[PDB]
């Protein structure tokens, strides 16, 4: 197929479409989590800003949960991804699932 | 799958009766025959 | 083979009738001659009570139990031989 960088750039481009609609947002995340990877921060970043243009706070939070879930028992991945997303979280006022209490069973 | 709550719930007591009646329906006739096997053989 | 005749331009009713009356029925009439000619009775062979023939492991479900279904007295002996 293609390099890692080309895979990521294609996904970044997908979510960065200015008039991305709600259906494309869902289709893109539901497809993306079928792969054997945790998405790069720059992909999640483009998907969070797409949530912002669609005025959908709750799906921004759900996308953070699914990053954490795709990492399985590799517990170092989620905290690294949140770290890299902080300036975007701060800029858009996205609270994480932990700051919301939504990580409690 | 999701489903509605039971339309006619079957409580623990009711399940105990259904389970008991079910097991008896298998055990008692066969038990009756096998218990009487010796009256059959020598008859 | 191709058999040895000819037609083939189109395979229609006329051709197949031509073959029914021009080939098939005449063959039947020939075999019929040939047979109604080699017919009339051939002599019955001496009876020998071979144990692999005239098998009876269970009486048949009709007549006296001992006669095959299309028993022909002239040519089918019973296990004890030909009938009176």
């Amino acid at each position: 197929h293609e390099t890692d960088e080309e895979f990521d750039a294609r996904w970044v481009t997908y979510f960065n479409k200015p008039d991305i609609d709600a259906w494309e947002l869902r289709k893109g995340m539901n497809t993306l989590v079928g792969y054997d990877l945790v998405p790069e921060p720059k992909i999640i970043d483009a998907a969070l800003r797409a949530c912002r243009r669609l005025n959908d706070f709750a799906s921004a939070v759900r996308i953070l949960e699914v990053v954490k879930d795709k990492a399985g028992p590799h517990k170092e991945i989620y905290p690294y991804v949140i770290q890299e997303l902080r300036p975007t979280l701060n800029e858009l006022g996205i609270s994480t699932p932990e700051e919301l209490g939504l990580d409690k069973v | 799958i999701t489903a509605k709550p039971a339309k006619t719930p079957t409580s623990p007591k009711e399940q105990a009766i259904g389970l008991s009646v079910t097991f008896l329906s298998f055990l008692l006739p066969a038990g009756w025959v096998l218990y009487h096997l010796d009256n059959y053989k020598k008859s | 083979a191709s058999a040895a005749k000819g037609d083939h331009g189109g395979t229609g009713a006329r051709t197949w009738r031509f073959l029914t009356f021009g080939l098939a029925l005449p063959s039947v009439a020939l075999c019929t001659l040939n047979s109604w000619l080699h017919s009339g009775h051939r002599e019955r062979p001496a009876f020998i009570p071979y144990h692999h023939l005239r098998i009876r492991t269970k009486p048949f479900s009709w007549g006296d139990g001992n006669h095959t279904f299309f028993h022909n007295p002239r040519v089918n002996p019973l296990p004890t031989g030909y009938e009176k």
Binding site: - | - | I48, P49, Y50, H51, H52
Partner: protein, 79 residues
Amino acid sequence: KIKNYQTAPFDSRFPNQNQTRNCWQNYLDFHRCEKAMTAKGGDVSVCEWYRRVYKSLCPISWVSTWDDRRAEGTFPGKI
């Protein structure tokens, strides 16, 4: 005259597990040979080998049934 018989030897015409035809063939051969000797006024003792072989191989009930059928005229093999 070439004796010391232990049992029927391996016979390459009947190499497999089913040996029914081996028994039958030697039974036939013996009785054909004995008939040819008793015809042409001669010695049945040249037939003895076949008798030894079929006696070794053949179940007693088969021999005995074949002997009764030859006496009755119902033996179906050609002798």
